């Protein structure tokens, strides 16, 4: 019942430092301030958490392990309590995103620490009496069509199989005909992700030869089989849990780069999904404030396939990867203005009527 | 040039089509043969918005008639104005639906739909530009619901940037003309709110009361009700068809009237409706029409809006008039009746004017509203629905043609979620 | 010679042009077929005044104006109305679809593919002038065409031509009245862009003209033409300094130099004092004092904004007819002597006067009346911020729920643009609040 928004301001690249563009993103500790190079207007931003990675010697450094121990481990702890969990990710191409979720071989990200602590606590908590099972699915969303990233298509060309969403009455919604493979060791997970990302939809526009035009969901599902009756072998209460980590595409604005084609039709749906997702997050944050409010989930696909993982006794989180430079300032604020959606205590009024607590 | 296609399904849509063309032909000056007998040159400048052309200036229409039983078609063809429609468009089959939604969406309708698509692509590609399509069906039977919704889905999957505007005769509270109305209507609403840009709900009991109280008729047959529906269809799209002072289009209505994509179910209405012996004792002016429009016993929605709040309003006027009276009277509506409107939008009203009125009236007006009250319809159907699903009354006629008990639940949950979505913007909450 | 290119965008601009060119062709003795019986009678003279018209060899004249709507319901009236033989046939019915009242259709999906023709035709108009340039863009807020296409055209003309005065005789939304409910968003996103490329954009509001036409003209059931002829008289009173002769001339540059102190506050108001009918045309002296006291009088301003809530940063005054400048000096002395007409500490001069020699004309079938002198005032204040504030309130009440945005991203826009425009709009509201402060050592 939370949003737990967060940012991450990367350090300069090598090309940027040789070209020597300006630093503009600063920090007043936790609160952030940014200063347009025209000396004209300053913009302020507050979040529940702020990660700084620009220069090492500054206190409050935000390493990869800091990211894990501050964001991810609570999701795992609440998964073990029998609830579900979701995590988001936002960033335009170049804002240091894939280095954050996946990481590198010598510099891990968030995914591997998550999965390895998963296996560790499995091998710890597990007994001869109790067990743990774990399955995976990994799919994508392109023009609001669902596609499965965990398969190889025929020798034909673009004959991608579009699947269908269906609402179960009890277990909640799901996708029809989705591969649900089994895993026990990280060597399987890396293999599956490598089959995945190479099938994801990518194109070349004015920003880079390699960008992302589709959302990508990575779902794990876990089962506690602590079901052992005293009289004999009989099962009482399995517990299912749904862990979810999604990489979202950027909200490219169609002005500097004329799209004139299918790329426009992708961008528009991508924009729509992001707007609806922010709208949902604001409503859930308000619901956490004790105020009953509607939670529009059927207005998009990525939410309708993730209803039960962002409501009730669930837990959520967001992370926003932005850039420090001035040559990527216009795409930078758009991220931060997209991640202001906590609105915890900002000028709430007060009216109350409560009496007759007596004879 | 803007161009529209009229799809026309069921035993209700085809009679409506006969009347609709019997009205638009008289507004554009066409005879049952095809020829032109008009009086003004404005009357064919934009005839292509609904019609096509021919060899000897016969001005043939654009119409696609998608029944499954030939009865309505064979009643239309041997009729007053059923001699012009392109006989390659009298599409039909056999083995009618039988007031079953499964026999129009899954098994039989698929053995006819591809022909209809081949006709639609023909009637589209021969247009210079396109603005949208139309579809008149009922909800309560098989053909108009199933076949119409399948066509909606496939057409929107083909041409999604264009508009799809559906005029639907939804069921009534008291006297149903079918026993399986809730099931069909609910399974259709599961496929209309997702795949449509604007739907204008219509009911017959409201039309009966509008024909009894206002017009003081004694023997109202369906001709008079379809006459009203045609009068609405016609004044919804004058802005594309004739000049004006503040023109409009269907996209403007579908934009301004639809804050969020789901809540596009609208209450229609027409003015000046008066008795045949009582037009002596009235003044054809703007405020009287504005009074008659927002009145509840003139709306075709079977639903007093005074039970709820107005979200957004579209009033299309016709006649040589003044815009100051329009703006002032709409202001006084926005002001004197604030509790019937929404506050997080300041301006819950827009306008549109054509300076070329109908054939025999100085002025006229048409009304479209997006309210919270229309949930009372859906809230009824669901209460009608589940009582039958909880005991599975008429289920097997729907499972014997390729279904399960899950899709019904999907439709019910979607409709109930929409009810809650409408309720979210109704209760008078103060910050 | 001098020249002023007049552009019209949308329904508002096209109808305003239908009125403005009626008035213009009435002033220069022109006939609706382009010809002139006057030169047939004379055989010479510059009466075919070429600040707006262009000559040919057949005694014919063409206006130096194009108009476009992306909505062919309008232009076909001109092509089959009274004024089809006059205009060049190059009027852009490219309106295969309407702009749907969303900035995104006017600015990207249908804005693109219709502007290169407009640029080519503007270039063909400009290469036929060896002199001044000024783009008088008659456009509108609220709508998608007058917002989008306007913002794109001024943006491109900032590049292709640069140092040339670009003006706009806009139509500002009323705070209560309107005819559209996605109206404010378009206005904000228009201001955010055209705060840079423009030089001075005038403003009117139809609620004010309604009140002005019932209170003074005494007509209670008006159309839009009876509102537009007043704006046409405003435009004529402006441009007569270039068309006709007089004692003090005020070209297009002088407005942008004498009323635009800071660049980001180039948003003045306008008014026209004698709006009396033939009945009230008698019983009244119509001197310069009555006018100059009436131009600063609320309920005769063309925008609903009490100036007394703020101060007057600058003021231009453009007269027509039998005027003795002495009376103007006396009038301005009187206006300065009063105390309910404030002024900034940093502008004691304040006024820019311009005097012509011709009176106005009288359109037949009109409501205004034959008079011996007429006036226009163009004021730059600190008051209309309040009006903008109302817009920047309404936006918020609509934006906090992301209403009417799916129709905007559905044609290629981003959410952030709304936030960027609102943030930019806040930077202006402080400027109008900053200059009103009186300096202190
Ligand atoms: C005083 C006068 O002019 O005669 C009116 C008249 O008295 C009334 C009764 C007409 C009459 O309408 C009806 O008879 C009627 C009765 C019950 C239900 C529906 C219609 C009229 O028949 C209807 C007819 O109106 C039209 O013809 C419109 O063009 C209408 N089309 C048709 O009626 C039509 C004509 C031929 C074939 C099919 C239909 C229309 C509406 C919208 C857009 C285009 C056209 C007119 C002027 C009248 C009569 C003749 C009495 C009214 O018609 C409408 C729909 O507005 C009912 O109230 C209006 C105006 C009058 O009250
Ligand atoms: N003063 C004046 N205002 C007008 C006139 N015509 C239209 N308007 C204003 O224009 C506004 C709506 O115009 P628009 O939405 O721009 O219509 P349009 O000019 O065709 O532009 P689009 O609809 O986007 O294609 C209304 O609020 C009117 O007040 C006119 O003739 N005179
Ligand atoms: N308004 C109106 N409704 C009609 C007309 N004819 C039939 N209906 C309605 O249509 C419904 C019956 O559905 P039907 O047309 O038989 O469905 P179909 O068998 O699939 O074509 C009932 O609710 C009727 O009220 C008509 O002429 N006018
Ligand atoms: N905190 C960090 N530590 C080290 N390198 C970083 C950090 N943040 C970003 N980078 C660098 O930024 C680059 C981002 O690569 P790229 O794949 O373009 O990112 P994105 O996922 O945004 O497309 C990487 O080469 C990475 O080394
Ligand atoms: Mg328009």
Note whether C209 and C272 are within 8 A (CB): no
Token duo for residue C146: 């007058």
* Cβ neighbours of A349 in B, within 8 Å: 431
Q: Could you tell me which residues are beta bridge partners of residue A142?
A: A145
Backbone φ and ψ of C189, nearest 5°:
-70, -20
**C65-68: strand order across its sheet:** C65-68, C6-9, C135-138, C166-169, C200-202
- Give the three-state DSSP class for A170: coil
Residues of chain C in contact with residue A334, where contact means CB-CB under 8 angstroms, are 414-416
A326 forms beta bridges with: none
| CA–CA dist A53, B52 (Å, integer) | 67
| Cβ–Cβ < 8 Å for B277, B312 | no
Judge: A293–B424 Cβ closer than 8 Å, yes or no: yes
The tokens 């969020």 sit on which residue? B260
Question: And the tokens for B294?
Answer: 């927002």
Distance from residue C94's CA to the centre of ligand 5 (Å) = 13
Please state the φ and ψ torsions of residue C233, each to the nearest 5 degrees: -70, -35
Distance of CA C90 to the CA centre of its chain: 23
Kindly determine whether residue A272 and residue C414, on different chains, have CB atoms separated by under 8 Å.
Answer: no
Q: Mutual orientation of helices A262-287 and C415-434 as an angle, nearest 10°?
A: 70
What is the rounded distance in angstroms from the CA atom of residue C99 to the CA atom of residue C72?
12
Chain B: give the shortest CA distance to residue A263, in Å.
15
Longest CA–CA separation in chain C, Å: 68
CA B45, B49, B54, B58 torsion-angle sign = negative
Helix (H, G, I), strand (E, B) or coil at A42: strand
Alpha-carbon gap, residue C389 to C430, rounded angstroms: 11
Catalytic residue among C254, C290, C297, C429, which?
A: C254
Q: How far is CA A70 from the centre of its chain?
A: 15
Angle at which helices C115-126 and C145-160 cross, to 10°: 50
Report d(CA B240, CA B28) in Å as an integer.
Answer: 13
b/e string for C226-242 if b means 16 or more Cβ within 10 A?
Answer: bbbbbbbbbbbbbbbbb
Instruction: Check residue A70 and report its DSSP letter.
Output: I
Q: Give the distance, in angstroms, between the CA of residue A295 and the centroid of all CA atoms in the same chain.
A: 18
Burial class (CB in 10 A: 0-12, 13-18, 19+), A145: middle
Restricting to A residues 290-349, those with a Cβ less than 8 Å away from any Cβ of C are 333-334, 337-338
A292 interfacial to chain B (CB closer than 8 Å)? no
Same structural domain for residues C319 and C197?
A: no
B133 DSSP β-pair partners: B5, B164
Ligand nearest to the CA of C10: 2
**CA separation for the pair B144, B10 (Å, rounded):** 5
Claim to verify: residue C5 and residue C147 sit in the same structural domain:
yes
Neighbours of B46 (CB within 10 A): 21
Instruction: Give me the domain span that covers residue C282.
Output: 269-383
What single-letter DSSP state applies at residue A10? P
Total domains in chain C come to 3
Which backbone phi and psi does C51 adopt, to 5 degrees?
Answer: -65, -25
Q: How far is CA C272 from the centre of its chain?
A: 13
CA distances, A233 to each of A129, A228, A237, A350, B409 (Å): 11, 6, 13, 56, 36
Residue B354, phi then psi, degrees to nearest 5: -110, 140
Sheet holding C373-381, edge to edge: C246-248, C351-356, C312-321, C373-381, C269-271
- Measuring from each residue's beta carbon to the nearest atom of ligand 1, which residues come in under 6 Å? B 22-23, 26-27, 215, 224, 227-228, 231, 234-235, 272-274, 276, 279, 358-361
On whether residue A352 sits in a domain, the answer given is no
One domain for residues C198 and C72: yes
With beta carbons less than 8 A apart as the criterion, state whether C15 and C6 touch. Answer: no
- Best of A296, A297, A303, A307 to substitute, by most chain B Cβ atoms within 10 angstroms, is A296
CB atoms within 10 A of CB A155: 6
Q: What is the DSSP letter of A356?
A: -
Rounded distance, CA C249 to CA C243, Å? 10
Ligand 3: residues whose CB is within 6 Å?
B 10-12, 15, 97, 99, 138, 140-144, 169, 177-178, 204, 222, 225-226
Which residues from chain C sit within 8 angstroms of residue A267, using beta carbons? Answer: 412
Residue range(s) defining the domain that contains residue A177: 6-338
Q: How far apart are CA B188 and CA A261, in angstroms?
A: 33
Query: Active-site residues of A: which are they?
Result: 94, 96-99, 247, 250
Instruction: Beginning with the edge strand found earlier in the chain, give each strand of the sheet holding B349-354 in spatial order.
Output: B90-91, B63-66, B4-8, B132-138, B163-169, B198-202, B265-271, B364-371, B310-318, B349-354, B244-246
Q: Do both C291 and C426 map to the same domain?
A: no
The distance of B259 to chain C (nearest Cα, Å) reads 5
Burial of residue A103 (CB within 10 Å: 0-12, 13-18, 19+) is: middle
Cα separation values, B37 from B25, B30, B313, Å: 10, 6, 37
CATH for A303: 3.40.850.10
**Residue A34 host element (H or E):** strand A31-35
- Partner A, chain B 395-414, Cβ-Cβ below 8 Å: 406, 409-410, 413-414
Gap between the Cα atoms of A260 and A267, Å rounded: 11
Please report how the helices C206-215 and C225-243 are oriented relative to each other, as an axis angle in degrees rounded to 10: 100
* Residue B144: partners with Cβ closer than 8 Å, 6 or more residues away: B9, B10, B11, B12, B13, B104, B137, B138
Per-residue 3-state assignment (H helix, E strand, C coil) for chain C? CCCCCEEEEHHHHHHHHHHHHHHHHHHCCCCCCCCCHHHHHHCCCCCCCCCCEEECCCCCEEECEEEECCCCCCHHHHHCCCCCCCCCCCCECCCCCCCCCCHHHHHHHCCCCCHHHHHHHHHHHHCCCCCCCCEEEECCCCCCHHHHHHHHHHHHHHHHCCCCCEEEECCCCCCCCCCCCCHHHHHHHHHHHHHHHCCEEECCCHHHHHHHHHHCCCCCCCCCHHHHHHHHHHHHHHHHHHHCCEEECCCHHHHHHHCCCCHHHCCCEEECCCCCCHHHHCCCCCCHHHHHHHHCCCCCECCCCCHHHCCEEEEEEEEEECCCHHHHHHHHHHHHHCCCCCECCCCCCCEEEEEECCCCCCCCCCCCCCCCEEEEEEEEECCHHHHHHHHHHHHHHHHCCCCCCHHHHCCCCCHHHHHHHHHHHHHHHHHHHHCCCCCCC
Residue located via tokens 């109202």: B220
CB of B281 less than 8 A from some CB of A: no
Contact B200, B165 (CB under 8 A): yes
Breaks (C-N over 2.5 A) in chain B follow: none
C254 has catalytic annotation:
yes
C322 shares its domain with C439: no
CA-CA distances (angstroms) from residue C319 to A332, B113, C202, C327, C335? 52, 72, 18, 12, 16
What are the tokens at A134?
């774990």
Domain ranges of chain B: 1-259, 260-373, 374-431
3-state secondary structure chain B: CCCEEEEECHHHHHHHHHHHHHHHHHHHCECCCCCECCCCHHHCCCHHHCECCCCCCCCCECEEEECCCHHHHHHHHCCCCCCCCCCCCEECCCCCCCCCCHHHHCCCHHHCHHHHHHHHHHHHHCCCCCCEEEEEEECCCCHHHHHHHHHHHHHHHHCCCCEEEEEEECCCCCCCCCCCHHHHHHHHHHHHCCCCCEEEEECHHHHHHHHHHHCCCCCCCHHHHHHHHHHHHHHHCCCCCCCEEECCCHHHHHHHCCCCCCCCEEEEEEECCCCCCCCCCCCCCHHHHHHHHHCHHHCCCCCCHHHCCEEEEEEEEECCCCHHHHHHHHHHHHHHCHHHECCCCCCCEEEEEECCCCCCCCCEEEEEEEECCCHHHHHHHHHHHHHHHCCCCCCHHHHCCCCCHHHHHHHHHHHHHHHHHHHCCCCCCCC
Are residues B225 and B318 in contact, defined by beta-carbon separation less than 8 angstroms?
A: no
Check the annotation: does C99 bind a ligand: yes
Buried-state track C398-426, b at ≥16 Cβ within 10 A, e below 16: bbebbbbbbbbbbbbbbbbbbbbbbebbe
Phi, psi torsion values for B335, nearest 5 degrees:
-95, -55
Q: How far is the CA of C132 from the centre of ligand 2 (A)?
A: 30
Give A72's DSSP letter.
I
Instruction: Report yes or no on A125 lying in a domain.
Output: yes
Asked whether the beta carbons of residue C397 and residue B345 sit closer than 8 angstroms, the reply is: yes
Q: C162 CB contacts (<8 Å, ≥6 apart)?
A: none
For chain A, what is the domain count? 1
Is C308 in the B-facing interface, judged by CB distances under 8 Å?
no
CA pair distance B90, C176, nearest whole angstrom: 51
Contact C64, C6 (CB under 8 A): yes
CB neighbours of C18 closer than 8 A, spacing ≥ 6?
Answer: C78, C83, C225, C228
Sign of the Cα pseudo-torsion (C284, C290, C294, C297, in order)? negative
Experimental method: cryo-EM
Max alpha carbon distance in chain A (Å)? 82
């Amino acid at each position: 019942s939370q949003v737990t928004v967060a940012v991450r301001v990367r350090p300069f690249s090598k090309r940027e430092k040789t070209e020597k563009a300006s630093q503009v993103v600063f920090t007043n500790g936790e609160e952030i301030t940014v200063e347009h190079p025209d000396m004209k207007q300053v913009y302020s931003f507050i979040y529940d958490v702020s990660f700084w990675s620009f220069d090492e010697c500054h206190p409050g450094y935000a390493s990869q392990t800091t990211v894990y121990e501050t964001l991810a481990a609570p999701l795992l702890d609440r998964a073990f309590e029998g609830y579900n969990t979701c995590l988001f990710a936002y960033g335009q191409t170049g804002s240091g995103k894939s280095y954050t979720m996946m990481g590198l071989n010598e510099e891990p990200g968030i995914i591997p620490r998550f999965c390895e602590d998963l296996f560790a606590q499995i091998a710890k908590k597990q007994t001869s009496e109790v067990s743990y099972h774990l399955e995976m699915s990994f799919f994508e969303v392109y023009n609001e069509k669902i596609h499965d990233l965990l398969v190889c298509k025929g020798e034909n060309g673009q004959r991608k199989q579009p699947l269908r969403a269906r609402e179960h009455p009890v277990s909640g919604p799901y996708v029809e005909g989705l591969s649900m493979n089994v895993v026990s060791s990280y060597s399987d997970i890396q293999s599956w992700l490598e089959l995945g990302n190479k099938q994801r939809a990518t194109a070349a526009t004015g920003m880079n030869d390699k960008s992302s035009r589709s959302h990508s969901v990575f779902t794990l599902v876990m089962t506690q089989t602590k079901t052992e009756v005293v009289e004999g072998e009989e099962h009482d209460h399995r517990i299912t849990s749904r862990i979810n980590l999604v990489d979202l595409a950027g909200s490219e604005r169609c002005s500097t780069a004329h799209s004139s084609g299918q790329r426009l039709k992708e961008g528009v749906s991508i924009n729509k999904s992001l707007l609806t997702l922010g709208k949902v997050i604001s409503a859930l944050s308000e619901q956490a404030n004790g105020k009953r409010v509607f939670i529009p989930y059927r207005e998009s696909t990525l939410t309708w396939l993730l209803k039960e993982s962002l409501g009730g006794n669930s837990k959520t989180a967001m992370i926003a990867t932005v850039s420090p430079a001035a040559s990527n300032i216009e795409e930078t604020l758009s991220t931060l203005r997209y991640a202001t959606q906590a609105r915890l205590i900002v000028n709430i009024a007060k009216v109350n009527e409560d009496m007759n607590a007596k004879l | 040039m803007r161009e529209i296609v009229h799809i026309q399904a069921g035993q209700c849509g085809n009679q409506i089509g006969a009347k609709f063309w019997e009205v638009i032909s008289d507004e554009h000056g066409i005879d049952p043969t095809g020829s032109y007998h008009g009086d003004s040159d404005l009357q064919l400048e934009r005839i292509n918005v609904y019609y096509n052309e021919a060899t000897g200036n016969k001005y043939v229409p654009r119409a696609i008639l998608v029944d499954l039983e030939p009865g309505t078609m064979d009643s239309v063809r041997s009729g007053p104005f059923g001699q012009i429609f392109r006989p390659d468009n009298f599409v039909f089959g056999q083995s009618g639906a039988g007031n079953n939604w499964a026999k129009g969406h899954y098994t039989e309708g698929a053995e006819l739909v591809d022909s209809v698509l081949d006709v639609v692509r023909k009637e589209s590609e021969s247009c210079d530009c396109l603005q949208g399509f139309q579809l008149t069906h009922s909800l309560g039977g098989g053909t108009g619901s199933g076949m119409g919704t399948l066509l909606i889905s496939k057409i929107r999957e083909e041409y999604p940037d264009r508009i799809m505007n559906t005029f639907s005769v939804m069921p009534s509270p008291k006297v149903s003309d079918t026993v399986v109305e809730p099931y069909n209507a609910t399974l259709s609403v599961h496929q209309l709110v997702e795949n449509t840009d604007e739907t204008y709900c219509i009911d017959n009991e409201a039309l009966y009361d509008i024909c009894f109280r206002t017009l003081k008729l004694t023997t109202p047959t369906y001709g008079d009700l379809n006459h009203l529906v045609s009068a609405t269809m016609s004044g919804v799209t004058t802005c594309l068809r004739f000049p004006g002072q503040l023109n409009a289009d269907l996209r403007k209505l579908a934009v301004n009237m639809v804050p969020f994509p789901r809540l596009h179910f609208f209450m229609p209405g027409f003015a000046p409706l008066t008795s045949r012996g009582s037009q002596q004792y009235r003044a054809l002016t703007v405020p009287e029409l504005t009074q008659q429009m927002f009145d509840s016993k003139n709306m075709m929605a079977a639903c007093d809006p005074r039970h709820g709040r107005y979200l957004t309003v579209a009033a299309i006027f016709r006649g040589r008039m003044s815009m100051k009276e329009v703006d002032e009277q709409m202001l006084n509506v926005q002001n004197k009746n604030s509790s019937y409107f929404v506050e997080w939008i300041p301006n819950n009203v827009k306008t549109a004017v054509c300076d070329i009125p109908p054939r025999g009236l100085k002025m006229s007006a048409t009304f479209i509203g997006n309210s919270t009250a229309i949930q009372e319809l859906f809230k009824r159907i669901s209460e009608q629905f589940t009582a039958m699903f909880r005991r599975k009354a008429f289920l097997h006629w729907y499972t014997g043609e390729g279904m399960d008990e899950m899709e019904f639940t999907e439709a019910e949950s979607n409709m109930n979620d929409l009810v809650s979505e409408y309720q979210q913007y109704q209760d008078a909450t103060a910050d | 010679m001098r020249e002023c290119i007049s552009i019209h965008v949308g329904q508002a601009g096209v109808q305003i042009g239908n009125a403005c060119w009626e008035l213009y062709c009435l002033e220069h003795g022109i006939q609706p077929d382009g010809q002139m019986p006057s030169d047939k009678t004379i055989g010479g003279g510059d009466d075919s005044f070429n600040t707006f018209f262009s000559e040919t060899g057949a005694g014919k004249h063409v206006p130096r104006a194009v108009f476009v709507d992306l909505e062919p319901t309008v232009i076909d009236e001109v092509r089959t109305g009274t004024y089809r033989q006059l205009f060049h046939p190059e009027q852009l019915i490219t309106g295969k679809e309407d702009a749907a009242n969303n900035y995104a259709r006017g600015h990207y999906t249908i804005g693109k593919e219709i502007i290169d023709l407009v640029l080519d035709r503007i270039r063909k108009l400009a290469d036929q002038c060896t002199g001044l340039q000024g783009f008088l863009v008659f456009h509108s807020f609220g709508g998608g065409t007058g917002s989008g296409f306007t913002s794109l055209l001024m943006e491109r003309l900032s590049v292709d031509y640069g140092k040339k005065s670009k003006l706009e005789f806009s139509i500002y939304p009323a705070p209560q009245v309107s005819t559209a409910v996605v109206e404010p968003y378009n206005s904000i996103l228009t201001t955010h862009t055209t705060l840079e490329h423009s030089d001075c954009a005038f403003m009117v509001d139809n609620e004010a003209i309604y009140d002005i036409c019932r209170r003074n003209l005494d007509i209670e059931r008006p159309t839009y033409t009876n509102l537009n002829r007043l704006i046409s008289q405003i435009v004529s009173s402006i441009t007569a300094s270039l068309r006709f002769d007089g004692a003090l001339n005020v070209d297009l540059t002088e407005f942008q130099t004498n009323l635009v102190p800071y660049p980001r506050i180039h948003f003045p108001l306008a008014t026209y004092a004698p709006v009396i009918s033939a009945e009230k045309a008698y019983h009244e002296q119509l001197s310069v004092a009555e006018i100059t006291n009436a131009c600063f009088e609320p309920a005769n301003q063309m925008v609903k904004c009490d100036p007394r809530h703020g101060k007057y940063m600058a003021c231009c005054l453009l007269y027509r007819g039998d005027v003795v400048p002495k009376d103007v000096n006396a009038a301005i002395a009187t206006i300065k002597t009063k105390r309910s007409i404030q002024f900034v500490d940093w502008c004691p001069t304040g006024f820019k006067v311009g005097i012509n020699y011709q009176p106005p004309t009288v359109v037949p079938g009109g409501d205004l009346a034959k008079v011996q002198r007429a006036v226009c005032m163009l004021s730059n204040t600190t008051a209309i911020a309040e009006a903008w504030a109302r817009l920047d309130h309404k936006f918020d009440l609509m934006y906090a729920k992301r209403a009417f945005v799916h129709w905007y991203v559905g044609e290629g826009m981003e959410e952030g643009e709304f936030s960027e425009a609102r943030e930019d709009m806040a930077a202006l509201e402080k400027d109008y609040e900053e200059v009103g402060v009186d300096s202190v050592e």
